[PDB]
Amino acid sequence: MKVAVLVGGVGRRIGMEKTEVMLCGKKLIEWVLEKYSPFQTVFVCRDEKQAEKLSSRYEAEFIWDLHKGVGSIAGIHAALRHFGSCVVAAIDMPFVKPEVLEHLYKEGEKAGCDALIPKHDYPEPLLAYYAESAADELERAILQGIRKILVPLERLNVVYYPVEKLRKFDKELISFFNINTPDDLKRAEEICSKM
Numbered sequence: 001m002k003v004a005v006l007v008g009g010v011g012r013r014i015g016m017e018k019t020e021v022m023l024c025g026k027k028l029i030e031w032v033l034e035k036y037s038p039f040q041t042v043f044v045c046r047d048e049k050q051a052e053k054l055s056s057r058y059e060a061e062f063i064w065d066l067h068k069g070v071g072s073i074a075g076i077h078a079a080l081r082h083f084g085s086c087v088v089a090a091i092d093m094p095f096v097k098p099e100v101l102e103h104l105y106k107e108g109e110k111a112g113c114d115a116l117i118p119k120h121d122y123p124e125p126l127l128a129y130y131a132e133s134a135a136d137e138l139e140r141a142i143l144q145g146i147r148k149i150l151v152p153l154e155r156l157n158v159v160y161y162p163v164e165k166l167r168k169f170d171k172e173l174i175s176f177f178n179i180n181t182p183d184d185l186k187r188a189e190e191i192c193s194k195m
């Protein structure tokens with residue numbers, strides 16, 4: 001299984017790069033490093049500059065969008081151009097369960113679709129399966145200056161997977177918990193504490 005971890009997120013509402021955020025005494029980048037090291041993983045940075053700073057800190061595969069694309073779409077595209085189909089996971093979700101990812105990848109591959117994205121009332125694109133066949137539409141969006149993943153997804157054959165079908169792998173669906181604002185760090189802390 002191939003995993004592309006999006007770590008180029010710049011913590012705006014938290015006043016510090018996401019990678020540096022301290023979760024239970026450990027940086028977020030070290031959280032995902034540990035969690036995904038067992039797989040065929042690449043960490044997608046916002047630019048080569050970040051890749052250089054992280055790679056001099058950790059022995060892992062750090063890549064970036066060749067044509068300096070910005071945002072999530074550019075990060076996913078970069079991963080697809082690097083090694084093909086994979087499951088994407090943002091660093092913003094430090095509690096993702098590998099079982100959940102494994103399922104998404106397998107189901108995504110067999111389904112024969114451009115992307116398999118978890119969904120309740122709204123989809124969660126940064127925690128889904130993307131096949132290589134989805135790269136062109138994503139790249140067109142990047143070149144057209146479109147930073148709304150929903151736009152290129154409409155031009156692709158997407159399979160929206162009921163988030164409920166994932167509870168068998170994740171009881172509380174904690175895999176979907178995102179850290180973006182002050183109230184999240186407070187909760188994130190309580191969660192990693194009870195663990």
Ligand SMILES: [Ca+2]
Nearest residue numbers: 133135136137
């Ligand atoms: Ca092509």
Ligand SMILES: [Ca+2]
Nearest residue numbers: 178180181184
């Ligand atoms: Ca939140």
